[PDB]
Amino acid sequence: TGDQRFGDLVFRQLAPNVWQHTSYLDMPGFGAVASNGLIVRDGGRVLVVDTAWTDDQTAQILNWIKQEINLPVALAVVTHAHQDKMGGMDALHAAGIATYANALSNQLAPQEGMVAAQHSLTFAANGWVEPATAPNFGPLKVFYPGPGHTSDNITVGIDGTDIAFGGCLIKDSKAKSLGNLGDADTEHYAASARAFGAAFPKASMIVMSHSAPDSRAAITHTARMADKLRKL
Ligand SMILES: [Zn+2]
Ligand SMILES: [Zn+2]
Structure with a gap:
């Protein structure tokens, strides 16, 4: 494997x-x-x-x-x-x-x-980390996508690679649910998943906490699950 x-x-x-x-x-x-x-x-x-x-x-x-x-x-x-x-x-x-x-x-x-x-770490209104709070982060590009899995969840791209890390915000493209929703913001989750995608628009390998690495289909599937949940 x-x-x-x-x-x-x-x-x-x-x-x-x-x-x-x-x-x-x-x-x-x-x-x-x-x-x-x-x-x-x-x-x-x-x-x-x-x-x-x-x-x-x-x-x-x-x-x-x-x-x-x-x-x-x-x-x-x-x-x-x-x-x-x-x-x-x-x-x-x-x-x-x-x-x-x-x-x-x-x-x-x-x-x-x-x-x-x-x-x-603190963040600008566009979601990007304030650089002075993340000194000497090298290739790590830190992005706050908005509330989703939790109010505080952040994400990280790795410059020089095809990889972006969604943490517990993103689930893979075959996930049956959004997992642990106890602390979740159901109104904004979908937009936050989409914001993650748009922050790292070239990333082809999406790494996440509770699934194996997946394609960008993980992002769209997560956002759909979130939108369904919000519509119930
Ligand atoms: Zn969590
Ligand atoms: Zn988790």
Whole structure:
């Protein structure tokens, strides 16, 4: 398939300098739910998008990076204040890694049971990150598409590649539903999915948290699901 197992994690190379990390929730009354993030090698440093579900899983991502890449991890960006994306913040901080999240994610973190990132990203009215808040992000192009899966969800394009990461906002083109809607903005979801597509109009590989990588059909399918839900 392209997947490789390392401990209880799975890694899949997407480009010469990009890998998808996958971790699984291990809690007594739940099935083994996968969550995907990214690892980007930016020359002489590594950038991480999203933690795993737990600190121990996140430390295993760092161990894979040390073994397989062996460059320092300069920063991590987390895409919203849920456990699958921010559950391993303490492991990043223990490792001396600078962490960034939407200001709103950092505000929500205590209510959600998450540790806040060290740095807050803010956004222009067009959705693009304010550059002074995202210094030295290299190829990572951060975009806030509007409320959707959550009020705080952000997305990330990787310059020099065909890849854009929708996080938990985007589901694949065969998804039966929008997954976890507990915190979702049903009025704006479809427009936010569309805004993600329009922000990264050349991306051909759409990476998402809870499906395998897909084509741009994931974006349109997600927006349709959202529009149906809104019309009910
Ligand atoms: Zn979520
Ligand atoms: Zn999720």
